[PDB]
């Protein structure tokens, strides 16, 4: 997670620990006059935090720094993963913006399929019989 992100924000290729320290310094210490906003999408956050849970804490903590302009968009399958991995105190400290994606209803799913076939349903074609 770190090796990628640092490489995506610095062009440097460092190890994972060196990348973690570099990201900590970059977010906490570098002034906001010499930075660009970063929008990180942590797709399948379930797989990242499975052994040491430090990826979640590091990525959510960097959004608490005043100098850091990081914006983390975390995607996971369980609605209470941070409350378990981090704990209630840490999660309350971070202050997420929590959103739940409920499964589609039959009407919404039908509308999705219909929009997927808007120009093709009840349409006309020229077919070469040969």
């Amino acid at each position: 997670c770190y090796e990628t992100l640092w490489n995506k924000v610095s062009g440097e290729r460092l190890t994972w620990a060196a990348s973690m320290e570099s990201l900590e310094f970059y977010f906490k210490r570098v002034p906001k006059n010499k930075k660009k906003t970063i929008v990180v999408l942590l797709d399948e956050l379930d797989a990242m935090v499975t052994k040491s849970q430090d990826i979640m804490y590091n990525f959510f903590n960097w959004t608490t720094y005043e100098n850091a302009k990081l914006i983390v968009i975390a995607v996971a399958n369980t609605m209470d993963l941070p409350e378990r991995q981090l704990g209630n105190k840490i999660t309350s400290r971070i202050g997420f913006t929590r959103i739940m994606f409920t499964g589609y209803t039959h009407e919404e799913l039908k509308n999705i399929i219909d929009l997927r076939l808007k120009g093709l349903n009840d349409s006309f074609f020229y077919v070469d019989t040969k």
Partner: protein, 291 residues
């Protein structure tokens, strides 16, 4: 070249300490300026490990480093090094360089065959004097012919009916032993500590039980369920316990030395702090002393 063994009813800790430090070391020093260093082994401690003891012995008396040919194929670097010490000290003047004092040689963690073999091999060296004490009544069952030959004991009976308050510190007396856990000694340490150290230990225990609950009662604490030192530094800074990592390490040195918390490096290269006590013991520590 006779190792001394003291048995009886009561606490021989005061006897052994006074004999070694106050009498034996100055007398050997004058008969051979500095006094002979004494390595006081506290065998009643359930957290006594032979790795640390041999590291202390190596620090006190520097041996020749174990060579590539002498390490063998995954050989025990402690036993091979001790045999190297024996060979080195076999042909050398028979002075005394160390006086290792073994309190309660039959204690919960000092009675095991590995550390007994370590002491047996160290007893061959005539340049270190061994003054050990035993409390268990079946203690001679520990040593076969080889170990009883390497020790070369001269048994002395010193019965004094002493209270043995220090030995009983490491396990609860009200429970009547209902031994090798070592959490009671940790709690006894926890009454007498700085408030900042107590808060840091409480935070470490809380986060470790959070990790254990995430993972899964009677399971011990290992590095699998433990905090990273960077994450722990961040938590302590958030709670103002430690200003920087240097101060946090300075505080953690006391807990590591007392075998209360362990910092070990995992496969990823992270260094993890873990308390080797079970969930119930940690809960008892938080409820009783850390409340």
């Amino acid at each position: 070249g006779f190792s001394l063994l003291f048995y009886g009813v009561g606490s021989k800790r005061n006897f052994l300490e006074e004999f070694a430090i106050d009498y034996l070391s100055p007398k050997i020093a004058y008969s051979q300026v500095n006094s002979i260093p004494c390595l006081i082994l506290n065998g009643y401690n359930p957290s006594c490990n032979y790795r640390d003891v041999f590291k202390e012995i190596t620090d006190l008396l520097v041996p020749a480093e174990l060579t590539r040919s002498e390490t063998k194929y995954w050989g025990n670097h402690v036993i091979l090094q001790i045999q190297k010490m024996i060979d080195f000290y076999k042909n050398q003047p028979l002075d005394i360089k160390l006086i290792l004092v073994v309190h309660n040689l039959d204690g919960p963690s000092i009675r095991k065959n590995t550390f007994q073999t370590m002491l047996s091999f160290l007893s061959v060296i005539r340049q270190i004097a061994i003054v050990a004490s035993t409390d268990h009544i079946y203690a001679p069952l520990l040593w076969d012919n080889m170990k009883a030959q390497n020790y070369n004991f001269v048994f002395h009976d010193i019965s004094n009916f002493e209270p043995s308050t220090v030995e009983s510190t490491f396990q609860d007396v009200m429970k009547m032993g209902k031994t090798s856990s070592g959490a009671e000694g940790a709690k006894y340490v926890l009454q007498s500590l700085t408030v900042n150290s107590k808060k840091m230990y409480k935070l470490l225990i809380e986060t470790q039980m959070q990790n254990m609950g995430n993972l899964s009662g009677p399971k011990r604490g290992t590095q699998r369920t433990g905090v990273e030192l960077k994450l722990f530094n961040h938590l302590c800074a958030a709670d103002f316990i430690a200003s920087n990592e240097i101060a946090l390490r300075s505080m953690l040195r006391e807990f590591i030395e007392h075998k209360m918390a362990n910092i070990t490096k995992n496969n990823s290269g992270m260094e993890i702090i873990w308390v080797p006590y079970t969930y119930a013991e940690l809960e008892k520590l938080l409820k009783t002393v850390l409340n």
